[PDB]
Symmetry: C3
Subunit: 543 residues, 3 copies
């Protein structure tokens, strides 16, 4: 029977049969079932002997610190892992029962409680975020470092599915072709919830966060260090949701970490949502002179050819910036940012294109100077601004087309704004006695319209009569001078004349005449520039 049993049954060892995880790992052939809670010590390392194992978790890994998995064979899968710390730290909860953010240090300190969730451990970033909190926090609430972390070290082709936990972290160190799939809402600890770190060895490639969600955590939910997806864009974050990150929802590191670059290139950031991060929704910048990366002589600061594939992202409720990035030659599309306390978008980009961007009700707390900032020479095609709630857009070197929304024109600063390809147009006016097409030359004034074409009701509704007026500003008084057609249904044109003797220089073109007033004779005269260019003054109207 043994011969037969050995050939007809599925192989699997279970943790309940061993004293240590390494013993179970050593006995494993195909499957490994975690069927009893396991308390690990920080730094406990397991060697899986290069075996391609299917690890099914039905219990917890309990401990502060890192549980290190090494030598897992390509194709290994770990499903249902649940990490939980032994320590219950002091956490702050910077929001109210009405879901309003608390910005006052004293109010935030008042939220202090010991829990493994529904808040996060304060870190130095909070000292900046809630000024004065550093001196108000009790000593036992400062410098905490609690995270129960599953560290996958130097493995290739390992996937972690439906992971969860309390004060949990997942670290892929020196890994390639690894994925964090369908994270089952783990509640974060002190470190990043999902981290792909490749500071040593080759640049990380094939590393993804696919689907799922995370909650809380003191720093960023998903973060990458020294990863390059190649032209194939093999890596990134797709279909992910981050809620209440103590740092940012999704972050590509910037600058030098250690003696090398922590920057990232050629990754995908698509179909993801970030809600209520304490800092930013998406922080995709690379610069904060670049050991291990391109020299400043090759690419100036904020001008690296990051080449990320960015599309279909939604951000709501950030206490910081909704969407931030830098780089040169980027194509970004379909970004929607709503209800943010700081800027909706902070873009240190150059020679980049932004298509179909919607920034709705941002910088609600005036943390920044604008709702959307673009530093370099960029192109914006389709920009929706203003929801239901300081410049709105400050992109001094950018050319923009297609803005929609109830924006205040005096709060727009761009290099060029134009609608070159509209068809025949109709201006529909509702709730007013007039319809208008206004012109504003920002060089003359950002606050006053310089001229206009209006249509005004004669009499009342259903009168079947209106008058058209063409105006010009004079003496900083909009519509100061104007020509009318059909005022009071008179069916004639009312023409403005120079109130005094017209100077020779008032007339512009040949074969034109300019009426002027001669008070001493109660006459209308006409300064005429003949077809040949010569001036002559004629009598136009008299008693």
């Amino acid at each position: 029977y043994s011969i037969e049993a050995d050939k007809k049954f599925k192989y699997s060892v279970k943790l309940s049969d061993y004293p240590t995880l390494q013993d179970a790992a050593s006995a494993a052939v195909d499957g490994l079932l975690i069927d009893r809670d396991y308390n690990f010590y920080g730094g406990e390392t397991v060697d899986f002997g290069g075996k391609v194992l299917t690890i099914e978790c039905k219990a917890k890994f309990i401990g502060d610190g890192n549980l290190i998995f090494t030598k897992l064979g390509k194709g290994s899968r770990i499903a249902g892992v649940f990490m939980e710390s032994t320590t219950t730290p002091w956490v702050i909860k910077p929001w109210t029962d009405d879901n309003q953010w608390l910005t006052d240090a004293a109010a935030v300190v008042a939220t202090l409680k010991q829990s493994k969730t529904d808040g996060y451990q304060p870190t130095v970033s909070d000292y900046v975020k809630f000024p004065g909190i550093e001196t108000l926090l009790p000593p036992n609430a400062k410098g905490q470092n609690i995270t129960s972390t599953l560290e996958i070290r130097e493995c290739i082709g390992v996937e972690v599915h439906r992971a969860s936990g309390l004060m949990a972290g997942f670290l892929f160190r020196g890994c390639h072709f690894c994925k964090m799939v369908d994270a089952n809402n783990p509640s974060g600890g002190k470190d990043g919830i999902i981290t792909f770190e490749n500071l040593s060895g080759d640049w990380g490639k094939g590393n993804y966060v696919i689907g799922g969600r995370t909650s809380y955590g003191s720093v960023s939910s998903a973060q990458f260090l020294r990863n390059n997806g190649g032209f194939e864009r093999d890596g990134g974050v797709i279909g992910f949701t981050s809620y209440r990150a103590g740092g940012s929802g999704v972050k590509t590191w910037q600058g030098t970490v250690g003696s090398t670059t922590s920057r990232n290139y050629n990754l995908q950031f698509r179909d993801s949502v970030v809600i209520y991060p304490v800092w930013d929704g998406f922080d995709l910048g690379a610069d904060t002179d670049r050991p291990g990366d391109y020299p400043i002589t090759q690419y100036p600061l904020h001008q690296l050819p990051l080449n990320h594939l960015i599309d279909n992202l939604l951000v709501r409720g950030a206490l910081g910036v909704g969407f931030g990035m830098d780089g040169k030659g980027m194509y970004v599309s379909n970004i929607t940012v709503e209800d943010c306390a700081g800027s909706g978008a902070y873009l240190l980009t150059h020679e980049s294109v932004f298509t179909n961007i919607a920034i709705i009700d941002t910088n609600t707390k005036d943390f920044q100077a604008n709702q959307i900032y673009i530093s370099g020479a960029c192109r914006v095609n389709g920009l929706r601004l203003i929801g239901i709630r300081s410049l709105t857009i400050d992109a001094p070197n950018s050319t923009v087309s297609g803005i929609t929304g109830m924006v205040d024109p005096s709060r727009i600063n761009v290099a060029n704004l134009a609608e070159e390809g509209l068809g025949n147009i109709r201006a529909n006016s509702f709730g007013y006695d007039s319809a208008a097409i206004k012109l504003r030359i920002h060089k003359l004034s950002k606050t006053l319209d310089s001229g206009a074409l209006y249509s005004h009701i004669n009499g009342g509704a259903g009168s079947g009569s209106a008058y058209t007026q063409l105006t010009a500003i004079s003496g900083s008084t909009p519509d100061a001078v104007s020509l009318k057609v059909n005022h009071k249904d008179c069916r004639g044109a009312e023409i403005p004349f120079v109130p005094d003797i017209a100077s020779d220089d008032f007339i512009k073109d040949s074969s034109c005449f300019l009426p002027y007033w001669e008070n001493n004779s109660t006459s209308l005269k006409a300064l005429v520039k003949k077809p040949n260019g010569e001036l002559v003054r004629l009598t136009l109207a008299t008693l």
Copy 2:
């Protein structure tokens, strides 16, 4: 060997070895394989003893009524379950071979057949949908109640994957943190296909419909009762497809069910598609005085702070309304609705913002008064209307910006419509001898333009000549009065004058003159309002 076998093999019991499902459940340790069809009786209940089981289905559960699963441990998964009724009911199929909807009661009654799919069992909702059908339906086709339902009762953390069936239903009763994942197109029965009902106990939380699709069913495909995802928005429908729901594709219940509220808050509704529902695509309203919920004194009817996260939804072919909802303070984005028989959007919302909405060819059967209705004070930023086919938009209290499409202006009713931030503009005219910029004051007339700026060809194509004309309406005749520049390439301005003696009140501004006709002397006179405001009549032109 037994000692060794017990430690090296995967544990799993199979249904073929037991007479009842409970016996198999009692013997189960890790896995449970459903390897033979099992006929269950309505109400048959299985107690899984709190065990964390992995149930793999490779056969069917056959029976009318509910098969009840209880006491499954957190982390349990059921994959490949297939529910099928024992009864083959009478179903109607309200659409043609060309996929046209049938709206006539007699034509619908003519479709009657006995089948477990390709149609649905008529219910009272059909009496409203196809008027007169109640009296035309044969008695054996009325009041049927066939559904083979898998009911998961009062469990936490249980996931159902790749479920399917015929006349199938999936009910999560009093569950939390449960998910219906990748539904493998089950064909529905009389009740909802996927239901998260939490009328008793705590409000449902962590309940999701992730991916997959469903077909048919008499009522809604996915529905929620008394669920609240919290600020974390932990719950909802993401990446789902519903086809031909006899009710609505996705529905959050409204009103009182029993003695409590069936309403829902803080859920996500994203990246989903609803096609051909008999009623609505997405019905996300909460109100139809609120036991178990906010009193009317706190929040008036249709003004609850639902706070759902709604984004990236597509609806096509609804016989009812494409997208419907109510609530106050909502942010809704990226909704696309096409080819619907009733309104594309029916919005009983207040103080809400709608960004990038596309309503294309809706209310094709005139079931409603408009294509899009908004009751309260809302903001719409980006609205695409008209495809290739009664008001189009009736949002009396809303402010709108950015409408695109071949809309008839007389069919637009809004509080305010404006394009405040456009750049320099060009009106490009194709197929006509003129280009135009028209003005329409809806208060004066919704059907006639009040004034215009035109450019008209002089001669023909390639003439290099055109004339510009500024017009005004008089006597309900658009363009009745006008000033021209370069008519017939004459290079002069043609000016309209009052056809009779101008009354003193015809002139508006000081330092302006208004030409008028004096027929008795064949002279042109000029009513002049001097710079000082005094009137004087002068002779302008004479023989």
Copy 3:
């Protein structure tokens, strides 16, 4: 014990215990583990006896040609399969280290190397793509046909999950309700990477490509032949990514293959991305007289009622066309195409609607005559054009509304272009001394504006003064004739007069006067069309 063991353990056979795959298949009951590499011969066929098996792959299937799986029971799943050829062919790599496409045949021939990846085997399509390459390629690099293919033949309800490979292909022949799920980036061979072919038997239905990605391959990444998803749209490609297809990313075949139709209907193509295909991103056409399909008498060429559900697609970097299709009565939405060498969109459609389309920087290599082409009578609602880089749009029979972007108006050709529903308007000018609203009648001239309304600064910035001017083109000189209001802050209107004796026909309307010059008397005269329609010439101004 045997009795007990037989009832408590999971059944699974492993390949290591058998000499052939068929032997393992014959012994299988529930699970089948591929735990050792298996070299198969082309055409090796395995009969699974109708068993519902769960095949877990932890090793490779090695061989050139097809490994054929037949008689798998409904519900069978194959996970982690890895196909690899025995031959290492000669591949070309038509792109540089800077990711620039190589278009020169000699440069492409220079890239030749033997590898199972990072390039593809040349085929006849390359002879067209890189002209002259056919004569430059060495004989050993021509006509190669290496693909290690897993062929699932005539099965129903079989799913392949997390498949991968090198020079790999996956062929579903005569299958229904089958899915290719989460493809783990297999590197393609000579044939299509994922193919659903239903040339024999019933039209394919229920076949999907869900999630995942593929890289390289000589032809199309995902392709369908004779599939019809029905009104339920049961089938298609959702959430998929294709990188560097030697052919197109996603393709529905056109024309006759063998003696029957290879066309497809009622499929879904949503939430997918195609990057860097050698040919097209999405090729969804059906026509290239239709055996096995609709006769030309019923539906003319390019006018089949395909009825696909198309939404939310992104294409970047195609060497060919970004998005192509044909058909009649189609609704297409939310398409984004960026940085393509050939047309962004090539649409042989009629009576179809396109909503929210963005074509950004396409036809960069002038391969086509335009960036977007539409042949038939279609409607486009929302069209974004131009990024940061020959007509732009040529849609002679289409009506368009809502174009945004820095488009050159002379490069637009449409049947009708209009913005019927805009509200009150403001034209904001940045960087210039004037703001303008221009009119262009394309029938008169596609390159010159026919008239304009300008506002120009008087003096300098902060002067609080500007002049408004209304112009008209004459003698092909834009703005040749004009009326001004407030030039040089004179507060009067400058009026142009006919430079010579005005002909009777110059005046258009009754009750209007047209000033004209009489050089011989240094007088301004006025051609007056009296209220009764009679002409009279009067003296207007004199010395």
